[PDB]
Design a binder for this molecule. Sequence first.
Ligand code: 919
Length: 321
Amino acid sequence: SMDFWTDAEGYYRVNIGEVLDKRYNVYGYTGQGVFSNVVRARDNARANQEVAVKIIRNNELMQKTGLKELEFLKKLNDADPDDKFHCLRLLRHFYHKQHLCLVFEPLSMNLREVLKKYGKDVGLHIKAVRSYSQQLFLALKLLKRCNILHADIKPDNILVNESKTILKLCDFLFSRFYRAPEIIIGKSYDYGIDMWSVGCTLYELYTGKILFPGKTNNHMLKLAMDLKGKMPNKMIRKGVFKDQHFDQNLNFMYIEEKVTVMSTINPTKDLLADLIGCQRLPEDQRKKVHQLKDLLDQILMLDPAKRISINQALQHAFIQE
Ligand SMILES: CNC(=O)c1cc(Oc2ccc(NC(=O)Nc3cc(C(C)(C)C)nn3-c3ccc4ncccc4c3)c(F)c2)ccn1
């Protein structure tokens, strides 16, 4: 998230049965987190309630990064005192053996794991996609209110409770698939990047498949333009990486090594067909799928200024009808 060898040293292995801050009885690992150990504990000081504790590495870079994370979470916590906007709740922090330790509400699994348990190319029920879409847009609403850009929304960064009724947005290879085109071309960017990533996620939640599985940044742009046609001229010109992907005449240079020069990219991606799949749907679910397709069309505009607003997303037929 962002405001709109000594870097890897100091890992701490917490033992099962260790008590932290004279209260957190560590009883299990989670596996989550990239650089820090995230453990499950019971809070002996608060009726043995379950928490997750992230133990950050003891080095300068990750200490400072930890403090920034703490600041972002406190800002969202204060902006949303009743927890209606679906961001992860930090409970408090402490220090242990020079490690900054962050204590969070416990959650069950991330949405990548939920998709895996649905099985290969299966996806969720459209009713769950509807509910999760609303919750995600509410998270977007809070982030924008707090002048925060996530910049890496994807199933791996969304956690759910045990019943899978509630999701919380959080932040910890796959990242390229969810990247907005303004980022790829190197244009100045805004809250629109997170709306884009939410669109990519929603498609994947329903189909079980990655929307834009591009091997490179060049391939990602081609796949986006296969949906929406060629990127606007004014957008191309403002990108600091435009020369990797477009020539002096703003023709797209499709790499496949061979370079195919394209003045036009005819839209060919059939989003509805891909959404429906081999399903024989009843008219009520079929209607909802059409509405999902329309929501995605409005999210996945190449120009971020022309994407659906957060409020228009919340009031879209997919959610409301
Ligand atoms: C059984 N239970 C479990 O398995 C289990 C595991 C579990 O693990 C964790 C999940 C998430 C986090 N952390 C975050 O999500 N941080 C965060 C949120 C945001 C948002 C809200 C702005 C998106 N930005 N940043 C965030 C992250 C890193 C940053 N770095 C620098 C600057 C700002 C930053 C902001 C964590 F530390 C541990 C939680 C609950 N249950």
